[PDB]
Amino acid sequence: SGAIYVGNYRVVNRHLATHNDWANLVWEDSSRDLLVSSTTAQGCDTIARCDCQTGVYYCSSRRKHYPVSFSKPSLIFVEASEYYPARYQSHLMLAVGHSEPGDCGGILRCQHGVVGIVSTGGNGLVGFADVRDLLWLDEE
């Protein structure tokens, strides 16, 4: 589980989005596994704008933050585990690291702020859904 709270936006894994998230839907993309919902409270997270390939992610299933190198955003095959058409997710950054389904929503951050959220796992790899190319999270 986990979300990003910037301004009046909540960013979550699309596949973990709640009835309330869908009721308050702002934007979603099935290919990117992202959903953004509107919030009444003002969020205090900052969205990195960069092409950093180093950062730290929170891994709930290890109660630990891991420093990682990660690939640039691209379209990738995600192997079966329990979820999705065990298929192709876009805007995905991979790193070598531990990821289970329950780790989705863990934040990846660099110096410039929040890079992305954990979106995939398996074979010793962790995949993160990049939010850096969603510049609109920054105003209204």
Ligand X SMILES: CS(=O)(=O)NCCc1ccccc1
SS3 23: helix
Nearest-approach distance from CB 85 to ligand X, in angstroms: 10
Q: Based on the number of CB atoms within 10 Å of its own CB, is 120 exposed (0-12), middle (13-18) or buried (19 or more)? A: buried
Q: Give how many residues touch Zn ion by CB under 5 A.
A: 5
22 forms part of the interface with ligand X (CB under 6 A): yes
Residue nearest to ligand X (CB): 22
Q: Which does 62 bind (CB under 5 to 8 A by kind): ligand X, Zn ion, none?
A: none
- Please list, residue by residue across 65-92, b when 16 or more beta carbons sit within 10 angstroms of its beta carbon and e when fewer do: ebebebeebeebebeeeeebeeeebebb
- Name the helix (H) or strand (E) containing 61: none
Q: Which does 110 bind (CB under 5 to 8 A by kind): Zn ion, ligand X, none?
A: Zn ion
Partner residues linked to 58 by β-bridges = 65
Pick the stretch among 15-23, 69-77, 102-110, 128-136 that binds ligand X (CB under 6 A). 15-23
50 forms part of the interface with Zn ion (CB under 5 A): yes
Q: Which residues are identified as catalytic? A: 15, 33, 104
Query: What residues make contact with Zn ion under the rule CB under 5 A?
Result: 48, 50, 52, 110, 112
